[PDB]
Design a protein around this ligand. Structure first.
Ligand SMILES: COc1c(C)c2c(c(O)c1C/C=C(\C)CCC(=O)O)C(=O)OC2
Ligand SMILES: COc1c(C)c2c(c(O)c1C/C=C(\C)CCC(=O)O)C(=O)OC2
Lengths: 418, 422
C-alpha cells in the first residue's frame, strides 16, 4: 500500500472439503477474502508482467505481507509486477470471520490449493502468463500442492520456510519438548482490552518491521462478541472489568482452535484396543502413513508433499530460515530431490532449484527481515524471467507457420500406414 | 430434448485457465468451453436426499450422446439408489465442444486438462450437485475421471471405469515388427465423404455390433456437413468426388477431426535423442512428463503410465469393467486393479472389498454401445453395494459427531497434548 492500489474480493471456494468435519454441513460454500495489489503506474502494463499468487502461514493475516510486497516492487529489476493476489485461508484471518457460522473443527491444507485454482479461473482475464507462486510456511506446502494440481500454471515458485518434511513435529510425547503446537492448544485467547492483548503478545512482535507492527495489532485481535466469545459482559465479569463500560475485550481473530487443527490433526482411533496394533481407519484417515500413526496426532501434507517433490514442474527457490524450528535437514533433502524425476523441472542438476539458507533468520523472517527476503526473491526472479523470455521466444519461433488444423509432415514419416 | 427416461439441459461452461501443453490452443490464454448435457430423470416423487450425481467422461472421438442408452438402462434398472442427474461433457477438442472451440484449438492435447475442466464444471453447478457424486469414465475418460479423483480425493463416493486407459506399456504403433494399431489408422484414415450415407459405410468398423439407439446417435453426431475449418470449400470437395451436378448430396467430414483424435491418442516425441551421443535426454521444456524408459520411440502417451503409478493412492472405491476382447494391455490392467487404493490416500483396495474387476468375456472396447443392458447391470450391482456402505458410513459419521462443538476442540486434545512447562 506504499506502492499499490488494493482491491478486496470475496470468492467462493472449492465444493466438498477434503475432511467432512471442516464445516457444519458438507455442501457449505466457504469464501476466501482476497486482496489484489496493483502497482500505481503511469505507463501501460508490460506484456510479461508477473501475476503473483501468495499464501500465508497459519494464523498470519495476509496484510502482514504488505511490506514484503512493497519491497518486491521497490527492488524489482528485469521484471514487472502485474499484481500480487493473497487470500486468507477459509478458516483463518478475514476469511474465517466471513465463514464463522460454517466452520468446524478440521482443516485440510489441500482445500486452499483447490480454492486458489478456482480464484485464478475466476480472475483469469487479469492473470495472463506468467504466474509465480509465493508460499510462507504451510502456505509453502499449499502453493506446491497447487503446482501438483496444475503443473504448467506457475513459471516458478518462491517458498519461504515451507512446511515440507517427513518427520512429525515435536508434541511433548515422552521426553520430547512441548512445541508451538502444545502452546497453541493451551494459550490465553481472550484479554480484557486490545492494549492488554498487545502487551501479552510482545514475544510474537519482537523484531517485527515497524510496518508489520500496526497490521499485527489491528488484524491479530478481534473485538468481542465472536461465536467463541458471544457474551461481552460475561468476559468483563471473568476479568472483573464490569465497571469500565468503555473498553471491549478482544480475542484471537483466528481462534487458537483453527490454528491448532491446521498445525496438526487428531489420530484418536489408530490402535486396535485388543492387539494394540496400528490399523489405519480408512473412513477418516486414509491419508495417514501407518509409520506416523504411532502417536494420536499427525499431519499428512508435509510428508505426502515431500514424497512428490521429484514431480514438481515449476523451477523452485527454497528460502530457509537458518534458525527455523522446522526440520531444516529434511527440508534440504527436499531441495535436493525437487524436480529431479518424471514431471519435474530438472531440479538442482539443471539449475532449476536453489536453496538460500539465511543464517540467524527465524520462521517470521517475511515480517522481521523484509528487505533481505525481498532481495533473495528478486535475484531468483530476474534469472527465471530471463529464461522465461528466451524459452517463450524459442517456442514462438519453433511454432511459426505450423498449422493449427492438421499435424506436421514428420507424423507420416514415423507412423506407418495400413 | 429427451432420452427415454430424462429431461436434457445443454450448457456451455468455460474450462481450465492455461492448458497443460502450450500448443493445445492458438493463444495460451484462450478460454476453451465444454458442451455439457445434464440428464434429469422425469420423476413423480421428490428427489431423495442421497440421490447420486454422476459425472461421466467419453472415449476419444466418441460423442457424449452415444452414452444416452446406457443412461436410460442405468435409470430403468436402478435398485437401492436414486439418480439426481447424469452430467457428461464433450472434451474441449472433440465432439460438440470442438465445434464451439474450432477457432481456438491447435495440434496438442493433455488428458489432464479435462480433469480440471470437470472440477470447474462441478464448482459451477455445485448447488445441483450435493453428495454423493459418482464418476464414470470410458477409455481415456476412465483415465481422466481417475485423475479428477487424484485432484480431489473425497469428491467421488465411487468410480465406474469402463475399459480405462490406465497401463504402463506404450500402444502398438507399427514400429519394427509390431502391428499398426487404431493410432496408425487414425493418422492415415479418409476423413471426408461425398454424402453421410457414404461416410457411414466407410466407418462400419467403429459401428459394428452397436445397439440401434447408439447407431442413430453415431450417424447424427460422428459426421458434420461441410463447410468446416479443415474443409471450408463445399464446391471444391463436390468437384473432387465428381458430385457437382447432384444438388441432393452434401459432403460430410469427421465431427472430431482425425488430427484431434490422433493428438489425444498419442503425442510427438520428435526430439528425445542427443544427436552426438545418440543417448535419450528428455527435453524438460516440452517433455518433462515423459518417462525416459518410453522415450526410445518418437511417440508417447504419458497419462496411462503416470495414472497407473499413482493407483495405490486412489481414494474412491473403484469398479473396473473390462471388455473381453479389449485392445488394452489386460494383464497390466489386472496388476493395476490389485494395487488400486492399497496405499496412502487409498480406499483400502481389493483386501477391503473397495476394488472389483468384472472382465466380461468376448465384449469389445465399445461395450458401452454394444452390450448396453449388461454394462448397466454390472454398474447397478456395484452401485447398490456402494450406496448401502455410503448410507451406513454417513449415519455413523453423524452419530460420532453428535455431541461435538464446531468452535473448540474436544476434551481428548487436553489429555494427549501436554502444556508448555511454566
Ligand atoms: C513445530 O512446528 C511444526 C513442525 C516442525 C511440523 C508441523 C507443524 O504443524 C508445526 C507447527 C506449525 C507452526 C507453529 C506454524 C506453521 C505456519 O506458520 O504455517 C507439521 O505439520 O509437520 C512438521
Ligand atoms: C491402440 O489403443 C491404445 C492403447 C493400447 C494405449 C494408448 C492409446 O492412446 C491407444 C489408442 C487410444 C484410443 C483408441 C482411445 C480409446 C478411447 O479413449 O476410446 C496409450 O496411451 O497406452 C496404451
Amino acid at each position: 500500500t506504499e506502492k499499490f492500489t488494493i482491491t478486496e474480493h470475496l470468492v467462493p471456494g472449492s465444493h466438498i472439503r477434503e475432511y467432512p468435519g471442516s464445516t457444519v454441513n458438507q455442501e457449505d460454500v466457504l469464501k476466501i477474502h482476497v486482496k489484489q495489489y496493483t502497482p500505481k503506474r503511469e505507463g501501460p502494463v508490460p506484456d510479461d508482467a508477473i501475476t503473483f499468487i501468495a499464501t500465508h502461514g497459519v494464523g498470519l493475516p495476509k496484510e502482514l505481507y504488505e511490506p514484503l510486497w512493497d519491497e518486491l516492487l521497490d527492488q524489482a529489476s528485469g521484471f514487472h509486477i502485474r499484481a500480487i493476489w493473497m487470500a486468507d485461508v477459509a478458516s483463518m484471518n478475514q476469511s474465517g470471520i466471513h465463514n464463522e457460522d460454517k466452520l468446524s473443527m478440521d482443516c485440510s491444507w489441500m482445500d486452499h490449493a483447490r480454492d486458489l485454482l478456482l480464484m485464478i479461473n475466476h480472475f483469469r482475464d487479469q492473470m495472463p502468463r506468467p504466474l509465480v507462486g509465493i508460499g510462507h510456511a504451510f502456505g509453502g506446502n499449499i502453493i506446491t500442492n497447487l503446482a501438483y494440481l496444475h503443473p504448467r500454471l506457475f513459471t516458478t515458485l518462491l517458498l519461504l520456510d515451507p512446511l515440507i518434511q517427513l518427520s512429525p513435529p515435536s508434541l511433548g510425547f515422552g521426553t520430547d519438548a512441548p512445541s508451538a503446537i502444545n502452546y497453541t492448544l493451551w494459550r490465553d485467547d481472550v484479554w480484557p482490552s486490545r492494549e492488554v492483548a498487545i502487551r501479552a503478545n510482545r514475544a510474537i512482535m519482537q523484531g517485527m518491521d515497524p510496518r508489520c507492527l500496526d497490521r499485527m495489532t489491528k488484524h491479530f485481535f478481534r473485538d468481542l462478541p465472536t461465536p467463541l466469545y458471544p457474551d461481552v459482559e460475561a468476559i468483563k465479569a471473568l476479568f472483573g472489568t464490569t465497571a469500565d463500560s468503555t473498553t471491549t475485550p478482544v480475542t484471537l481473530t483466528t481462534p487458537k482452535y483453527h490454528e491448532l487443527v491446521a498445525q496438526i490433526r487428531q489420530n484418536f482411533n489408530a490402535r486396535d484396543p485388543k492387539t494394540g496394533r496400528i490399523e489405519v481407519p480408512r473412513d477418516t484417515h486414509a491419508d495417514m502413513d501407518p509409520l506416523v500413526a504411532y502417536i494420536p496426532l499427525y499431519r499428512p501434507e508435509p510428508r505426502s508433499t515431500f514424497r512428490r517433490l521429484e514431480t514438481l514442474r515449476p523451477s523452485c527457490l527454497w528460502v530457509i530460515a537458518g534458525a527455523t524450528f522446522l526440520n531444516i535437514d529434511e527440508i534440504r533433502e527436499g531441495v535436493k530431490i525437487c524436480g529431479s524425476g518424471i514431471g519435474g523441472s530438472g531440479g538442482v542438476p539443471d539449475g532449476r532449484v536453489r536453496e538460500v539458507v539465511l543464517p540467524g533468520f527465524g520462521h517470521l523472517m517475511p515480517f522481521q527481515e523484509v528487505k533481505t527476503v525481498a532481495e533473495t526473491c528478486i535475484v531468483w526472479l530476474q534469472q527465471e524471467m530471463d529464461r522465461f523470455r528466451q524459452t517463450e521466444r524459442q517456442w514462438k519461433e519453433d511454432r511459426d507457420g505450423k498449422s493449427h488444423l492438421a499435424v506436421e509432415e514428420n507424423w507420416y514419416k514415423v507412423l506407418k500406414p495400413i
